[PDB]
Amino acid sequence: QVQLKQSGPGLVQPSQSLSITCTVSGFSLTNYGVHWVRQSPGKGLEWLGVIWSGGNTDYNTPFTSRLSINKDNSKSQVFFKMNSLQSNDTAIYYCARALTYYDYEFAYWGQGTLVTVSAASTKGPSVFPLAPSGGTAALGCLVKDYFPEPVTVSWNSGALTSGVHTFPAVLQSSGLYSLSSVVTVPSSSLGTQTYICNVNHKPSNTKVDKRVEPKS
Amino acid sequence: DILLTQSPVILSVSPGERVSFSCRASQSIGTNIHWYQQRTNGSPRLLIKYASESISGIPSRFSGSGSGTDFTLSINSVESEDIADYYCQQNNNWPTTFGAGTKLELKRTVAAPSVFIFPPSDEQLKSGTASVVCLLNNFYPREAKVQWKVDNALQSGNSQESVTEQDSKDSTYSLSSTLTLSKADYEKHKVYACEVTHQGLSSPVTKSFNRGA
């Protein structure tokens, strides 16, 4: 199956450079072009450029100066690099592949890379339990004080998904993000099942499994 | 560059209804338009290419028409999983450009929130900060009020809210209100209440707890 997997989300200092690796499989870079597209608050979906099968590059007009795309066919990797990031370069960056080798109808996308342009320091979150206390109990995790976005949360290593709500992160006055993730479960299952939130903050390499129990 | 104007900005429909999205181009672009779906936390998903041509794996309730400057994406019978944003793309003219999207919202019956309150963990208290969390789960419509009281004092400016997008299955929203105070303030008080007001409740519902009980 065609897949495109991008390098992890991260922070870029203002006036510094952005590097993203798109690693593809299910097809060969000698047969298809790989495009780059971003999605910003300022400009929504915006096509950046493409490296074609044969190694040629096109860049959208305002990026010819600061954009460079390269690839390693053998390693099935596409390298994106943009110079001189300002704050409004904060966006989700995607790599993409078209249906047919020469075209622009994007059937296959990378999972996106959230890029924050900021002078601030990376900071891993603390994870605190939201302990449970008509037969349905609610429990969760408070994922507090991290930068930048995003953080991933799942429950019981991917096994628990039903009744999970992971709230949009909110920016506190401290300039650090906070988030909760909740799940509702049968209260009779609290003495039987273990409930763990798996928290991953890639920009800080912070991985935490937080067991959440009824308070004694 | 071609400018693509999508209208309206928000669409609200009931399940099983038909729905149409407009994409209008600044000059004629033939039938060189593609359509995409973006779900919450998703990458775009290609729905229709070249105005009307189907895409493998895309359900048949999706279709598109139009030529020249005026284009239409249609869903003949909306399902709850269609809750998303929709974007058009032209590629008649370099560079390929996208419209600014239309949000698809689903109507459903009123559902009162289930309310839960969570004291700060003792773990967090060791950091000198206290977070009190109030959860309003699975309600509709989105409008709701959370009012915090500490020892009967109305709390103001020290809470933040986050609301999920519509659930893809039951079309409900969930809301978290977080009340943040210093450990010192937290220890100086006893009764913590969040009062929830919503169209599906005949009275406001209060969940509360006494510190250390």
Binding site: Q39, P41, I92, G112, L114, E149 | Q38, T40, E165
Partner: peptide, 12 residues
């Protein structure tokens, strides 16, 4: 409206 980076959704 706004395009929101956290959710990848139109926020109106």
């Amino acid at each position: 409206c706004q395009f929101d980076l956290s959710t990848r959704r139109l926020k109106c």
